[PDB]
PDB file of C-alpha atoms (C1' of nucleotides) in Angstrom:
ATOM      1  CA  UNK A   1      29.239  12.784  25.250  1.00 41.40           C
ATOM      2  CA  UNK A   2      30.103  11.614  28.867  1.00 41.40           C
ATOM      3  CA  UNK A   3      26.889  13.351  30.242  1.00 38.58           C
ATOM      4  CA  UNK A   4      24.594  11.886  27.466  1.00 40.31           C
ATOM      5  CA  UNK A   5      26.377   8.363  27.844  1.00 37.35           C
ATOM      6  CA  UNK A   6      25.589   8.720  31.673  1.00 37.99           C
ATOM      7  CA  UNK A   7      22.034   9.588  31.392  1.00 34.42           C
ATOM      8  CA  UNK A   8      21.611   6.816  28.599  1.00 36.93           C
ATOM      9  CA  UNK A   9      22.964   4.299  31.069  1.00 39.27           C
ATOM     10  CA  UNK A  10      20.618   5.548  33.786  1.00 40.72           C
ATOM     11  CA  UNK A  11      17.354   5.192  31.980  1.00 40.50           C
ATOM     12  CA  UNK A  12      18.563   1.950  30.535  1.00 38.93           C
ATOM     13  CA  UNK A  13      19.457   0.821  34.103  1.00 40.08           C
ATOM     14  CA  UNK A  14      15.810   0.523  35.211  1.00 40.96           C
ATOM     15  CA  UNK A  15      14.582  -1.573  32.245  1.00 39.31           C
ATOM     16  CA  UNK A  16      17.955  -3.604  32.648  1.00 38.16           C
ATOM     17  CA  UNK A  17      17.266  -4.390  36.167  1.00 39.45           C
ATOM     18  CA  UNK A  18      13.654  -5.299  35.606  1.00 40.16           C
ATOM     19  CA  UNK A  19      14.364  -7.597  32.962  1.00 39.60           C
ATOM     20  CA  UNK A  20      17.270  -9.307  34.983  1.00 42.82           C
ATOM     21  CA  UNK A  21      15.023  -9.672  37.930  1.00 46.10           C
ATOM     22  CA  UNK A  22      12.815 -12.170  36.037  1.00 43.51           C
ATOM     23  CA  UNK A  23      15.618 -13.605  33.608  1.00 44.50           C
ATOM     24  CA  UNK A  24      18.536 -14.383  36.122  1.00 42.95           C
ATOM     25  CA  UNK A  25      16.594 -16.947  38.574  1.00 41.96           C
ATOM     26  CA  UNK A  26      15.057 -18.816  35.548  1.00 40.78           C
ATOM     27  CA  UNK A  27      18.663 -18.831  34.167  1.00 37.48           C
ATOM     28  CA  UNK A  28      20.030 -20.416  37.277  1.00 36.61           C
ATOM     29  CA  UNK A  29      17.513 -23.206  36.876  1.00 38.46           C
ATOM     30  CA  UNK A  30      18.924 -25.772  34.610  1.00 39.89           C
ATOM     31  CA  UNK A  31      17.078 -29.080  35.537  1.00 43.39           C
ATOM     32  CA  UNK A  32      13.957 -27.390  36.880  1.00 46.58           C
ATOM     33  CA  UNK A  33      13.330 -25.626  33.352  1.00 44.94           C
ATOM     34  CA  UNK A  34      12.790 -28.993  31.711  1.00 43.79           C
ATOM     35  CA  UNK A  35      11.392 -30.491  34.859  1.00 40.26           C
ATOM     36  CA  UNK A  36       7.747 -29.926  33.661  1.00 41.55           C
ATOM     37  CA  UNK A  37       8.335 -32.375  30.847  1.00 38.39           C
ATOM     38  CA  UNK A  38      10.985 -34.633  32.312  1.00 38.49           C
ATOM     39  CA  UNK A  39       8.796 -35.270  35.284  1.00 40.31           C
ATOM     40  CA  UNK A  40       5.942 -36.430  32.940  1.00 38.65           C
ATOM     41  CA  UNK A  41       8.484 -38.349  30.899  1.00 37.53           C
ATOM     42  CA  UNK A  42      10.039 -40.338  33.789  1.00 38.95           C
ATOM     43  CA  UNK A  43       7.217 -40.890  36.212  1.00 35.87           C
ATOM     44  CA  UNK A  44       5.570 -43.497  33.938  1.00 38.30           C
ATOM     45  CA  UNK A  45       4.843 -47.141  34.337  1.00 39.90           C
ATOM     46  CA  UNK A  46       7.577 -48.407  31.958  1.00 38.44           C
ATOM     47  CA  UNK A  47      10.178 -46.201  33.225  1.00 39.48           C
ATOM     48  CA  UNK A  48       9.825 -47.264  36.745  1.00 40.57           C
ATOM     49  CA  UNK A  49       9.527 -50.964  35.765  1.00 40.08           C
TER      50      UNK A  49
ATOM     51  C1'  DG E   1      69.517 -50.257 -56.137  1.00 40.13           C
ATOM     52  C1'  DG E   2      64.749 -49.534 -53.725  1.00 42.25           C
ATOM     53  C1'  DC E   3      62.082 -47.130 -50.166  1.00 39.59           C
ATOM     54  C1'  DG E   4      60.668 -44.735 -45.665  1.00 38.99           C
ATOM     55  C1'  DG E   5      61.462 -40.376 -43.473  1.00 38.88           C
ATOM     56  C1'  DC E   6      62.135 -35.320 -43.401  1.00 41.34           C
ATOM     57  C1'  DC E   7      62.085 -30.652 -44.916  1.00 42.41           C
ATOM     58  C1'  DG E   8      60.749 -27.202 -48.270  1.00 43.31           C
ATOM     59  C1'  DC E   9      57.412 -25.312 -51.571  1.00 41.53           C
ATOM     60  C1'  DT E  10      52.980 -24.008 -53.184  1.00 38.86           C
ATOM     61  C1'  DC E  11      47.833 -24.199 -52.590  1.00 40.13           C
ATOM     62  C1'  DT E  12      43.985 -22.814 -49.872  1.00 40.20           C
ATOM     63  C1'  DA E  13      41.334 -20.619 -46.630  1.00 37.87           C
ATOM     64  C1'  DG E  14      40.043 -18.069 -41.996  1.00 40.93           C
ATOM     65  C1'  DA E  15      40.329 -13.770 -40.451  1.00 40.28           C
ATOM     66  C1'  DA E  16      41.814  -9.012 -39.237  1.00 37.19           C
ATOM     67  C1'  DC E  17      41.239  -4.606 -41.512  1.00 36.83           C
ATOM     68  C1'  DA E  18      40.014  -0.678 -44.602  1.00 34.29           C
ATOM     69  C1'  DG E  19      36.807   1.279 -47.715  1.00 36.86           C
ATOM     70  C1'  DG E  20      31.885   2.250 -49.588  1.00 41.08           C
ATOM     71  C1'  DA E  21      26.817   2.903 -48.316  1.00 39.00           C
ATOM     72  C1'  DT E  22      22.758   4.677 -46.359  1.00 37.48           C
ATOM     73  C1'  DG E  23      20.110   5.828 -42.301  1.00 36.96           C
ATOM     74  C1'  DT E  24      20.263   8.310 -38.917  1.00 37.00           C
ATOM     75  C1'  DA E  25      22.976  12.151 -35.027  1.00 36.66           C
ATOM     76  C1'  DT E  26      23.709  17.355 -34.842  1.00 37.03           C
ATOM     77  C1'  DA E  27      24.456  22.825 -36.398  1.00 36.09           C
ATOM     78  C1'  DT E  28      22.132  26.240 -37.506  1.00 35.39           C
ATOM     79  C1'  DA E  29      17.322  29.382 -39.714  1.00 40.02           C
ATOM     80  C1'  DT E  30      13.374  29.989 -39.041  1.00 39.33           C
ATOM     81  C1'  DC E  31       8.497  29.094 -37.938  1.00 41.29           C
ATOM     82  C1'  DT E  32       5.445  28.369 -34.488  1.00 45.07           C
ATOM     83  C1'  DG E  33       2.360  27.093 -31.204  1.00 44.12           C
ATOM     84  C1'  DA E  34       1.414  25.854 -27.001  1.00 42.28           C
ATOM     85  C1'  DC E  35       3.694  27.633 -22.026  1.00 43.47           C
ATOM     86  C1'  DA E  36       3.576  30.191 -18.438  1.00 43.37           C
ATOM     87  C1'  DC E  37       2.960  34.764 -16.843  1.00 45.62           C
ATOM     88  C1'  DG E  38      -0.509  38.487 -15.708  1.00 45.52           C
ATOM     89  C1'  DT E  39      -5.281  39.799 -14.678  1.00 45.90           C
ATOM     90  C1'  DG E  40      -9.873  39.547 -13.243  1.00 47.82           C
ATOM     91  C1'  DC E  41     -12.744  37.597 -10.699  1.00 49.02           C
ATOM     92  C1'  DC E  42     -15.208  34.443  -7.899  1.00 46.07           C
ATOM     93  C1'  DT E  43     -16.272  30.156  -5.757  1.00 46.90           C
ATOM     94  C1'  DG E  44     -14.678  26.738  -2.565  1.00 45.56           C
ATOM     95  C1'  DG E  45     -11.684  26.240   1.618  1.00 45.91           C
ATOM     96  C1'  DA E  46     -10.739  28.261   6.360  1.00 48.07           C
ATOM     97  C1'  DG E  47     -11.686  30.784  10.927  1.00 49.56           C
ATOM     98  C1'  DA E  48     -15.173  30.437  13.937  1.00 47.16           C
ATOM     99  C1'  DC E  49     -19.024  28.281  16.135  1.00 48.50           C
ATOM    100  C1'  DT E  50     -22.489  24.487  17.630  1.00 47.99           C
ATOM    101  C1'  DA E  51     -23.469  19.788  19.047  1.00 49.48           C
ATOM    102  C1'  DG E  52     -22.881  14.865  19.503  1.00 50.26           C
ATOM    103  C1'  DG E  53     -21.206  10.433  18.672  1.00 48.10           C
ATOM    104  C1'  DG E  54     -17.689   7.096  17.614  1.00 47.09           C
ATOM    105  C1'  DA E  55     -13.278   5.440  19.262  1.00 46.32           C
ATOM    106  C1'  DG E  56      -9.451   5.439  23.189  1.00 46.28           C
ATOM    107  C1'  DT E  57      -9.187   3.659  27.119  1.00 47.88           C
ATOM    108  C1'  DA E  58     -10.084   0.599  31.070  1.00 49.79           C
ATOM    109  C1'  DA E  59     -11.923  -3.650  32.530  1.00 48.63           C
ATOM    110  C1'  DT E  60     -13.468  -8.643  32.078  1.00 44.67           C
ATOM    111  C1'  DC E  61     -13.520 -13.112  30.046  1.00 45.16           C
ATOM    112  C1'  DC E  62     -13.049 -17.100  27.894  1.00 44.48           C
ATOM    113  C1'  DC E  63     -10.608 -18.815  24.368  1.00 44.86           C
ATOM    114  C1'  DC E  64      -7.260 -20.171  21.361  1.00 45.67           C
ATOM    115  C1'  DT E  65      -2.650 -20.504  19.616  1.00 42.21           C
ATOM    116  C1'  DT E  66       2.111 -21.862  21.417  1.00 39.70           C
ATOM    117  C1'  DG E  67       4.959 -24.718  23.637  1.00 39.68           C
ATOM    118  C1'  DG E  68       5.593 -29.316  24.733  1.00 37.86           C
ATOM    119  C1'  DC E  69       5.140 -33.577  25.368  1.00 39.84           C
ATOM    120  C1'  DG E  70       5.578 -39.047  22.815  1.00 41.56           C
ATOM    121  C1'  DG E  71       3.648 -43.103  19.036  1.00 40.57           C
ATOM    122  C1'  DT E  72       3.584 -44.509  14.891  1.00 41.14           C
ATOM    123  C1'  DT E  73       3.602 -45.352  10.656  1.00 40.17           C
ATOM    124  C1'  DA E  74       3.631 -42.322   6.124  1.00 38.86           C
ATOM    125  C1'  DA E  75       7.018 -40.294   4.050  1.00 34.37           C
ATOM    126  C1'  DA E  76      11.484 -37.437   3.062  1.00 34.92           C
ATOM    127  C1'  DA E  77      16.341 -38.819   1.968  1.00 32.15           C
ATOM    128  C1'  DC E  78      20.124 -41.505   0.141  1.00 29.15           C
ATOM    129  C1'  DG E  79      21.601 -44.579  -3.141  1.00 28.27           C
ATOM    130  C1'  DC E  80      21.475 -48.092  -7.298  1.00 28.56           C
ATOM    131  C1'  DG E  81      19.941 -49.142 -11.654  1.00 29.57           C
ATOM    132  C1'  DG E  82      18.909 -47.580 -15.852  1.00 31.82           C
ATOM    133  C1'  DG E  83      16.314 -45.108 -19.291  1.00 30.26           C
ATOM    134  C1'  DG E  84      14.512 -42.027 -22.274  1.00 29.52           C
ATOM    135  C1'  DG E  85      15.054 -36.944 -23.402  1.00 29.61           C
ATOM    136  C1'  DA E  86      17.816 -31.929 -23.884  1.00 26.47           C
ATOM    137  C1'  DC E  87      20.726 -30.614 -26.348  1.00 29.85           C
ATOM    138  C1'  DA E  88      24.943 -30.133 -29.405  1.00 32.13           C
ATOM    139  C1'  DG E  89      25.384 -31.016 -34.145  1.00 30.20           C
TER     140       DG E  89
END
DNA sequence: GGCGGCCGCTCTAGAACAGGATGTATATATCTGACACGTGCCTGGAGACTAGGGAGTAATCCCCTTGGCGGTTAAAACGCGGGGGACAG
């Protein structure tokens, strides 16, 4: 059971890491995730007025 | 002495229960008639082979649906009045 759980963890490890490589940095971005819409919303004429 | 109130008595009726009735549930007896087993083929699938052609895969590309924004006014939702219909009878 230990050996099979170990190799199960081993081949799950690669997909786990490749998913976390693109997930973690985007997760750390909080304001920048909504920046693509907030910049369009707030850099307008009436907002600056 | 008269009358309202209370309790007992008999009348009546709803309902649970038992018995009769008639059309089906079964216990054999026996028929019987297709069921499946055996046989004899024999005719269509399978091994093997030849050839070729349509899709799997790779690449591209441009295109089209998803996410994502607001504006706005049409509309969903809430609530009040009420009114005509579903349903019990």
